[PDB]
Amino acid sequence: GYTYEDYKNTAEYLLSHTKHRPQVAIICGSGLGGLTDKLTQAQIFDYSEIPNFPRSTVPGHAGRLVFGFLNGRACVMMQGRFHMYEGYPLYKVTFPVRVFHLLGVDTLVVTNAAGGLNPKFEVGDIMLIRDHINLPGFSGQNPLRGPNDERFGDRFPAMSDAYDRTMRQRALSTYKQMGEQRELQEGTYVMVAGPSFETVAECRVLQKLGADAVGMSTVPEVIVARHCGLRVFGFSLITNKVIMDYESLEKANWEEVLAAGKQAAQKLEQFVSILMASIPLPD
Amino acid sequence: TLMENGYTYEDYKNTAEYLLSHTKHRPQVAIICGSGLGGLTDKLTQAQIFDYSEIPNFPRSTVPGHAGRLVFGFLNGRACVMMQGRFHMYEGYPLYKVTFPVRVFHLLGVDTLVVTNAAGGLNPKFEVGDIMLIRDHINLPGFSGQNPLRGPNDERFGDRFPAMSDAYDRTMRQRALSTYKQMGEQRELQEGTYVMVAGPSFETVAECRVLQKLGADAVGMSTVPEVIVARHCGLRVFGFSLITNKVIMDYESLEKANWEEVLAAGKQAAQKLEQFVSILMASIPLPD
Amino acid sequence: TLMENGYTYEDYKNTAEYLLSHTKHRPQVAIICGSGLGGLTDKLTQAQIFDYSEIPNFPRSTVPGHAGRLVFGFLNGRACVMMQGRFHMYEGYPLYKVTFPVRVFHLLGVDTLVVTNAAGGLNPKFEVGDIMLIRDHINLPGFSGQNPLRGPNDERFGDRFPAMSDAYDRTMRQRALSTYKQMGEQRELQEGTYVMVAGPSFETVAECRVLQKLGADAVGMSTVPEVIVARHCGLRVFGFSLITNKVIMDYESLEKANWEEVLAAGKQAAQKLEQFVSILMASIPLPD
Numbered sequence A: 001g002y003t004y005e006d007y008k009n010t011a012e013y014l015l016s017h018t019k020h021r022p023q024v025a026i027i028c029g030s031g032l033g034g035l036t037d038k039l040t041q042a043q044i045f046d047y048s049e050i051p052n053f054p055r056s057t058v059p060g061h062a063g064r065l066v067f068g069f070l071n072g073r074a075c076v077m078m079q080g081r082f083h084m085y086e087g088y089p090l091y092k093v094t095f096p097v098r099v100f101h102l103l104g105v106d107t108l109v110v111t112n113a114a115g116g117l118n119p120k121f122e123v124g125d126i127m128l129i130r131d132h133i134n135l136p137g138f139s140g141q142n143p144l145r146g147p148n149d150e151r152f153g154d155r156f157p158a159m160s161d162a163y164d165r166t167m168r169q170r171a172l173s174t175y176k177q178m179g180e181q182r183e184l185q186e187g188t189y190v191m192v193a194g195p196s197f198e199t200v201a202e203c204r205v206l207q208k209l210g211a212d213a214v215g216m217s218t219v220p221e222v223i224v225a226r227h228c229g230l231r232v233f234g235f236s237l238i239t240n241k242v243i244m245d246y247e248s249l250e251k252a253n254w255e256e257v258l259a260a261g262k263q264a265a266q267k268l269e270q271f272v273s274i275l276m277a278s279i280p281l282p283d
Numbered sequence B, C: 001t002l003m004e005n006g007y008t009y010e011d012y013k014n015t016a017e018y019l020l021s022h023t024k025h026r027p028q029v030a031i032i033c034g035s036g037l038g039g040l041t042d043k044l045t046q047a048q049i050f051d052y053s054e055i056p057n058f059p060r061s062t063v064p065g066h067a068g069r070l071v072f073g074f075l076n077g078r079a080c081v082m083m084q085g086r087f088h089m090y091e092g093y094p095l096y097k098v099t100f101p102v103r104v105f106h107l108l109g110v111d112t113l114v115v116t117n118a119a120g121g122l123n124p125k126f127e128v129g130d131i132m133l134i135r136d137h138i139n140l141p142g143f144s145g146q147n148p149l150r151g152p153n154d155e156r157f158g159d160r161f162p163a164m165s166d167a168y169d170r171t172m173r174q175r176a177l178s179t180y181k182q183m184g185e186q187r188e189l190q191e192g193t194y195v196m197v198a199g200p201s202f203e204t205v206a207e208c209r210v211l212q213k214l215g216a217d218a219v220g221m222s223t224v225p226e227v228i229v230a231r232h233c234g235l236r237v238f239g240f241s242l243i244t245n246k247v248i249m250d251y252e253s254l255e256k257a258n259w260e261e262v263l264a265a266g267k268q269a270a271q272k273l274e275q276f277v278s279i280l281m282a283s284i285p286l287p288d
């Protein structure tokens, strides 16, 4: 899809257009665009200004790349992201990850909204992503499909350790700092392509498969990130409980999802601030 | 290099107008007849027939048992339009071509879609010749990206993220099941989850068993993408499978699924189907 | 804008005719060599070697442990053509390229295909170094639309809806199991279901757990497309995996799948593999 030079071009475009030198990249999903609010000395890029960048066409995805310091830390944030249901191939969806690597970022934080499949979750919960299930990947939709470029990484990268074990413990301990009543949740994110929401039968297959939450993003970004050796941390905001019986009259919808994010804005902001303090310095 | 719908709003609109200007029929219900079920268009009174090839932007049915004709008429008194034959992803069509007619039906003023198919039996309680109402579906091609709504959303048709949890109209299902206990038939009207797989090869024994483990009662290679585009644009949806064979679930059996036996089960069932479609038409509400 | 086969019947013909004139070999059996199994061409007698690059229409092998050569000759006195290295969908190839050779073999007069691969053990009872006979497969890419038979069907090759429930030849299996339970190692022959996933990245723990729950004993990124195309054109098919690693199934292990060790386990088993493959030639019926 893209040449090595295409990524370099975008990398160089940004490097020459800002003095910031991010160490940490954060991708903000549906309703989590607010996480850019506590950035200091921010510099804003529209995705439309950036060579080779796709556009966010989804409500709650602003379409901006924001550099700054978050709680001391040098960040670049994706205020909005791309999804395969919008029609992008996965090499477009994940394009920014390898540009982050080329900017010298060494850690990727992925966030998303997710439907809750585990009965113990409540709307509003933060689930740490311990693992994932890549259903598009099983059948061919893997962002590494095609010729492998050794300058980014190996032909057959492993995913069994994709989610940093250290940052996960560190995030579990330091969670008492939030003073929140609900304990910090941990579990498996299954990616599904969408854009339509799950039937009850589908929700039940996803539960049987062992997933705790379901969304339509995140996995391709993580795969590309581990391919090029970035440390990865992920979490979902549980925005709704996916309908798991034929008696409920509730149905999933996007407005409720954006609204759950708006209500949890401060909780998330605190969580992410604390998290920056837990990322080790480079070298 | 973005994976989108090839058709424009104009395209659907033109097909709608060509159809509206070349027939006086004004259907409320559209019905899609699957493999061996072309026979459902028999009791159409005042039938008028289009070959798919006449109709601008229409795909062709290449599969045996799919006649490739669009038939307007009345069925048990109700104004219908019927797809005698349908389209499948395994023929090589993108899902946007497979489901193309569903948006045409909407623009014609149809407010109800009934989707029919042949399906392999996964639930061991099902006998060849049973009718299984579709209570729900498992969209495997959709899990991994094969979804007819992939790409730019058109708000003229519907929402970016429609829900599918209520796809199969409950009331019609209640109504059809009630009616059928009075028929005092030898076999029960079955109800269950249809799973879509892409095809065109039939399941291995290990695949049949994953499908049973996922909770599907029937398997086929169609229907789901149509149900999704229909719910997207607000049609009431009803679905049924004619169970045409039992999927091989053990290594002993020397039997194999085959397309001939599938079409032969359609012939054998012509009476049950005809009788069932009656109950069905009298279960569909009147416009307003 | 159909997703059809990009090869014409004549394409296959040209490749076959080219091969048939440039060698005096006439294979009855074709064998596809998986990752680290390139060494199976060693026992071939009177070998004639083609590089894939010479053969018209042939895809190129881009993966380590995949030599990229076609090798005719005799194995335990039986006439063979061996693919020394194969093609995978993760390389970027569509399934009509991945499986291109299978139909050429058919045109060459081949009537039996033996597919080999390396695979990750999902069944706890398996050990690195085991040979697992493929009793069956679970085709995940196929469920969602990645089937090499998608698009127009060419009747000159086969049927529009070939059954796969009898894909792995039952007779060859029994016969191989017998011969082996009288000669070889003390470590007995394994049998099970091979699940294809696309790759090229290795499984999460979560994913490993899914594949286990679906009832797979081994996982790989190949094999299934070639089998489907072979069964489609009426080849007898036999398959086996070399378990080259045990897939990580808990969060406590500090082991990780890696391709270098996969190839290492191929080296380790090279002798065991040859001994078994002779026994195998003796189980293949002769043409009438």
Ligand SMILES: Nc1nc2c(CN3C[C@H](CO)[C@@H](O)C3)c[nH]c2c(=O)[nH]1
Binding pocket: A030, A083, A112, A113, A114, A115, A116, A192, A194, A197, A198, A214, A215, A216, A239, A240, A242, A252, A253, A254, A255, A257, A258, B161
């Ligand atoms: N598949 C799925 N995804 C989500 C999400 C995640 N994204 C939220 C947004 C639509 O609201 C899409 O990009 C999916 C939240 N809830 C759900 C859900 O119930 N199901």
Ligand SMILES: Nc1nc2c(CN3C[C@H](CO)[C@@H](O)C3)c[nH]c2c(=O)[nH]1
Binding pocket: B035, B063, B088, B117, B118, B119, B120, B121, B197, B199, B202, B203, B219, B220, B221, B244, B245, B246, B247, B257, B258, B259, B262, C161
């Ligand atoms: N997948 C699948 N589909 C069917 C069907 C439904 N269709 C029947 C037709 C081929 O005979 C295809 O279009 C799929 C009947 N039996 C089976 C089955 O055993 N398996």
Ligand SMILES: Nc1nc2c(CN3C[C@H](CO)[C@@H](O)C3)c[nH]c2c(=O)[nH]1
Binding pocket: A156, C035, C088, C117, C118, C119, C120, C121, C197, C199, C202, C203, C219, C220, C221, C244, C245, C247, C257, C258, C259, C260, C262, C263
């Ligand atoms: N999916 C998968 N495949 C394999 C294989 C088989 N092939 C080995 C090669 C990478 O080493 C790929 O072509 C897949 C061995 N082990 C595994 C595994 O753990 N997982």
